[PDB]
Design a binder for this molecule. Structure first.
Ligand SMILES: *[C@@H]1O[C@H](CO)[C@@H](O[C@@H]2O[C@H](CO)[C@@H](O)[C@H](O)[C@H]2NC(C)=O)[C@H](O)[C@H]1NC(C)=O
Ligand SMILES: *[C@@H]1O[C@H](CO)[C@@H](O)[C@H](O)[C@H]1NC(C)=O
Ligand SMILES: *[C@@H]1O[C@H](CO)[C@@H](O)[C@H](O)[C@H]1NC(C)=O
Lengths: 193, 48, 96, 48, 48
């Protein structure tokens, strides 16, 4: 819920550990434009135990939701937020026009478009250094130089396919010994022999 | 498949999604069994 | 490098195909000030291939530059030059 | 040739139209109408 | 698969999609190798 989530180039990240996770609360949210869990059935999410959960929140474009998937293509997928090919976790995307749109233009959300090379998976780039095209050195705005960060320019009058989409990725590492986050299932007595 | 344990595939996936992983494991293990049996038949002929 | 440019309402349309597109000259152009690409990486144009390319040239006002974008609204966008919502291409603009 | 044809007809919100599919999730799918993992047939949705 | 060349699959499809084609090639070539080795074993028994 919160109130504000950072831009894609600086996606907000938090860790969930040492607590019991009740994924049923996720069902409290109505819209759920996209709810895609890779490597785990959502209904089974309450029965397993995860080592450490990572929640990554940001705001993606209307049509860039599909780029949040392993091995996807496009500027967003391999320039600002790259998912691993062996990703195991859930992806949630819901509309935010009523909260993340300004009539005069919501320019508070920015995405990077120019960079030397694609990012490694789960890599964040927060630098705002100018981009150089060719071999001519760049010292400011001008030819062969551009600002990598571009504003989304979100407007409520835009179509649904161009509306802002709050996107949160819950990435968890499966059973690799030190399990901390566990489902709400109650334990029982132990019997031997 | 995602995991080599059928229990781990079944405990984390719905039936329709788990069918694929269980089938990958079935195909691999059937291939290994067939290889074992063929080699055993050849060795049995030699020992005979 | 055309001496004369067509009007915005009568934007000049040209088709280019069956040739190799060199974007080095376009990059080397100095007076360029508005370079925006949607759907494709601008630095990957030299590698990506397509079927045909369409070039639409016209002259507008300085404040009308932002109107030439998918999903935008305005007099120029509505009644002079409209772009598809799923447009996958580039727009370049320079002072004249 | 089909042994027996069933027609389940209802009205739902447009955004939940994609919810009518085997193995899907959602309030309409979970609590109103769920299709089996091996459903065979067709789904036709039109605005009314 | 789309082609019998590993690099042709590599530079035509994304990794997640190319996984299926590369796995089809791997299964086919493994079947070829297993067939060759089994035939060699039978022929070696005859020659022995
Ligand atoms: C992700 O967002 C959460 C929620 O805002 C941040 O966690 C808390 O943020 C508030 C508001 O800034 C701080 O006062 C708290 O101290 C934060 N708590 C903790 C435990 O850090 C979180 O910092 C954000 N993550 C990043 C990387 O920005
Ligand atoms: C969600 O956030 C809004 C404010 O942004 C708040 O009014 C509302 O109660 C929140 N919902 C919760 C905490 O369930
Ligand atoms: C655009 O201008 C060129 C160069 O003069 C001309 O050959 C072509 O016919 C023009 N196209 C249109 C659609 O006016």
């Amino acid at each position: 819920n919160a109130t504000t989530f950072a831009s894609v180039y600086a996606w907000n990240r938090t860790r969930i550990s040492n607590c019991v996770a009740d994924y049923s609360v996720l069902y409290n949210f109505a819209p759920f434009f996209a709810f895609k869990c890779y490597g785990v059935s959502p209904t089974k999410l309450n029965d397993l135990c995860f080592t450490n959960v990572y929640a990554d929140s940001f705001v993606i474009k209307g049509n860039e939701v599909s780029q949040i998937a392993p091995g996807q293509t496009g500027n967003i997928a391999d320039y600002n937020y790259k998912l691993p090919d062996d990703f195991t976790g859930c992806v949630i995307a819901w509309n935010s026009n009523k909260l993340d749109s300004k009539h005069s233009g919501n320019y508070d959300y920015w995405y990077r478009s120019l960079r030397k090379s694609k990012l490694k998976p789960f890599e964040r780039d927060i630098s705002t250094e100018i981009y150089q095209a060719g071999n001519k050195p760049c010292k400011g705005k001008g030819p062969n130089c551009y600002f990598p960060l571009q504003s989304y320019g979100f407007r409520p009058t835009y179509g649904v396919g161009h509306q802002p989409y709050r996107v949160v990725v819950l990435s968890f590492e499966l059973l690799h010994a030190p399990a901390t986050v566990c489902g709400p299932k109650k334990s029982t007595n132990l019997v031997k022999n | 498949a995602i995991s080599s344990v059928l229990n781990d595939i079944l405990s984390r996936l719905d039936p329709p999604e788990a069918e694929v992983q269980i089938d990958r494991l079935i195909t691999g293990r059937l291939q290994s069994l067939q290889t074992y049996v063929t080699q055993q038949l050849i060795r049995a002929a030699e020992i005979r």
